[PDB]
Design a protein around this nucleic acid. Structure first.
Ligand SMILES: Nc1ncnc2c1ncn2[C@H]1C[C@H](O)[C@@H](COP(=O)(O)NP(=O)(O)OP(=O)(O)O)O1
Ligand SMILES: [Mg+2]
Ligand SMILES: [Mg+2]
Ligand SMILES: [Mg+2]
Length: 432
DNA sequence: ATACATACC
DNA sequence: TACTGGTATGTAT
């Protein structure tokens, strides 16, 4: 498959000049400035501050290190090319062919064949077709994916009944308890037939082989898996042998540190495009560099960020799955071809409010904060929020609040019309 | 509390 | 022709 410059070449040539690209520059500059600002303060940092922080951080680091929990076994399962794999399963014509699930405007994912051409999730179809004109863009069938998801979630329930579904295709499992019961199971209880039988051992490696086997037998789709003593690690491992493979970080401190040693921080869940580029500008790329700079980082970043970075640098993370409690927000948003007539924008706001009210009606939810989201034709995004004393829920009450927030924004630019491409409404601040 | 940014599927 | 929908969290004021 294609190189890796030829790709970015095509994307640039196709993106450059678009209102969309304009905005991406506007953001990258707003980030570069944020780096430059950080960069200053690093210069104004003294050696006797550095020493002061270093003795503080290490005091906290000894507290984390002494509390390290290796006694749990955490599994992250992540379906392989989920949507695309499903559409491949049920249409032989795509057998050995590059595909992507989505529209010509936007793609959800792509199969590994198509990923060799640099077509990826969150790419517009029309750009992906320039990277690979044989690409088959198959429309998404959300409802199938939900149904397939339910089939695997049923299997996963056997090993951890409190497993944490992150989305349709992925989940964390705490198999610690299952491995204890399984230690002294007969071959009967861990024997599965092929769709002539097969058997799996008593170890963690084997349990996960059984899970991934049953998943393939039930759904005709492969999954990858990661094993570790915490979620943060397990999530990373699950990606290591993708597609259709496992990895284990064994529950001993040395192994953890061996894995961490040269791990690019980007691979950790929650270090993205920006934090990478920010941490790179301090010379931090691996998770040991992140450890080494821990004093400096305590001065340049907020408490939560450097606390989080320290957990990353020590190979720490969550060692029990907290059963997802109540939601914090519900929202709906929609992109469209340009709208500028005020009366059409009110109507469209009123529609979204109705849809949100209907989704609230499902889970019997009422909130206090209504937040409209507007994104003009140049991709610039405004949110405007208003909190109310008493909780609201109906399409009328939500619209009443959103109406004004929108009105204000139409008035502000007056006599210029709001030229928007996306509107949304969110409700939040639900009671405890 | 409000705004905007960053991240994940 | 065409650049998503969605929830939670962070950063800053
Ligand atoms: N940015 C995005 N926008 C829309 N849909 C997306 C998306 N990212 C993912 N999806 C959809 C499409 C995906 O099928 C599904 C699961 O997301 P993953 O597990 O992150 N990606 P996959 O399973 O395809 O491949 P593998 O894990 O082997 O790399 O969510
Ligand atoms: Mg995934
Ligand atoms: Mg996946
Ligand atoms: Mg990351």
């Amino acid at each position: 498959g294609l190189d890796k410059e030829k790709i970015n070449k095509i994307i640039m040539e196709a993106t450059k000049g678009s209102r969309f690209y304009g905005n991406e520059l506007k953001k990258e500059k707003q980030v570069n400035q944020r780096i430059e600002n950080m960069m200053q303060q690093k210069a104004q940092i003294t050696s006797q501050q550095l020493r002061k922080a270093q003795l503080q951080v290490d005091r906290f680091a000894m507290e984390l290190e002494q509390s390290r929990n290796l006694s749990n076994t955490i599994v992250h399962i992540d379906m392989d090319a989920f949507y695309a794999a499903v559409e491949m399963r049920d249409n032989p014509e795509l057998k050995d062919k590059p595909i992507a699930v989505g529209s010509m405007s936007m793609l959800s994912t792509s199969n590994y064949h198509a990923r060799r051409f640099g077509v990826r999730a969150a790419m517009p179809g029309f750009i992906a077709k320039r990277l690979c004109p044989q690409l088959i863009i198959v429309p998404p069938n959300f409802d199938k994916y939900r149904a397939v998801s339910k089939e695997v979630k049923e299997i996963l329930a056997d090993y951890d009944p409190n497993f944490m579904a992150m989305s349709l295709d992925e989940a964390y499992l705490n198999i610690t308890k299952h491995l204890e019961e399984r230690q002294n199971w007969p071959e009967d209880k861990r024997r599965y037939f092929i769709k002539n039988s097969v058997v799996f051992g008593t170890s963690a490696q084997e349990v996960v082989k059984e899970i991934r086997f049953r998943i393939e037998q039930k759904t005709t789709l492969t999954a990858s898996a990661g094993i570790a003593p915490n979620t943060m690690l397990a999530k990373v491992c699950s990606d290591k042998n993708k597609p259709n493979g496992q990895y284990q970080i064994l529950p001993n401190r040395q192994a953890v540190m061996d894995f961490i040693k040269d791990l690019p921080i980007r691979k950790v869940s929650g270090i993205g495009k920006v934090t990478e580029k920010m941490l790179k500008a301090l010379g931090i790329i691996t998770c040991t560099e992140l450890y080494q700079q821990r004093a400096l980082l305590s001065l340049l970043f907020s408490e939560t960020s450097w606390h989080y970075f320290l957990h990353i640098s020590l190979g720490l993370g969550s060692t029990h799955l907290t059963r997802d409690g109540e939601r914090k927000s519900m929202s709906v948003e929609r992109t469209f071809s340009e709208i500028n007539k005020a009366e059409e924008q009110y109507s469209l706001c009123q529609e979204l409010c109705s849809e949100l009210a209907q989704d609230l009606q499902k889970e019997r939810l009422k909130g206090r904060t209504v937040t409209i989201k507007l994104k003009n034709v140049n991709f610039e995004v405004k949110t405007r929020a208003s909190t109310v004393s008493s909780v609201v829920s109906t399409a009328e009450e939500i619209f009443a609040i959103a109406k004004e927030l929108l009105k204000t924004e139409i008035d502000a630019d007056f006599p210029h019309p709001l030229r928007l491409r996306l509107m949304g409404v969110r409700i939040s601040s639900f009671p405890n």
